[PDB]
Design a protein around this ligand. Structure first.
Ligand SMILES: Cc1cn([C@H]2C[C@H](OP(=O)(O)O)[C@@H](COP(=O)(O)O)O2)c(=O)[nH]c1=O
Ligand SMILES: [Ca+2]
Length: 129
């Protein structure tokens, strides 16, 4: 897989940012994860964690997997990196998302995120508390 450039247009919630990619505005949805929505428990904390991570980053990058690159809503599907740190992975690691929506051929980082969730679950972090 390879990292490609984008710039933050706006942090939306745990699951999504609007990013500019190849010069065009797009909503991106994070592969392999599910954060609580805003009114659910840890929903606000997930959005704050993502917002801070992507807003403080000097460099935002997107990384597509082998399969579908846009979902049925036209959202880009990618792993998102903030100064080289994967945001998808860091949400799970922190107990602010679960590994979810693991589809065949779009799941290269499945095992890496499942390990992160195991540790968050072991530390009883947030969602796992
Ligand atoms: C993460 C992800 C979601 N989706 C679709 C499936 C779900 O459909 P439905 O809207 O029909 O449930 C929806 C979940 O996204 P959200 O968790 O952002 O709602 O997005 C994909 O098709 N591919 C993906 O990789
Ligand atoms: Ca969600």
């Amino acid at each position: 897989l390879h990292k490609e450039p984008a710039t933050l247009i706006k942090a939306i919630d745990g699951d999504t940012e609007k990013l500019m990619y190849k010069g065009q505005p797009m909503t991106f949805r994070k592969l392999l994860v599910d954060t609580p929505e805003f009114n659910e428990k840890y929903g606000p904390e997930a959005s704050a964690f993502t917002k801070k991570m992507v807003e403080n980053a000097k460099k935002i990058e997107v990384e597509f997997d082998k399969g579908q690159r846009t979902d049925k809503y036209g959202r880009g599907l990618a792993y998102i990196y903030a100064d080289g740190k994967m945001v998808n992975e860091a949400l799970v690691r922190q107990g602010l998302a679960k590994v979810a929506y693991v589809y065949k051929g779009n799941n290269t980082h499945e095992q890496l995120l499942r390990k992160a969730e195991a540790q968050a679950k072991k530390e009883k972090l947030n969602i796992w508390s």
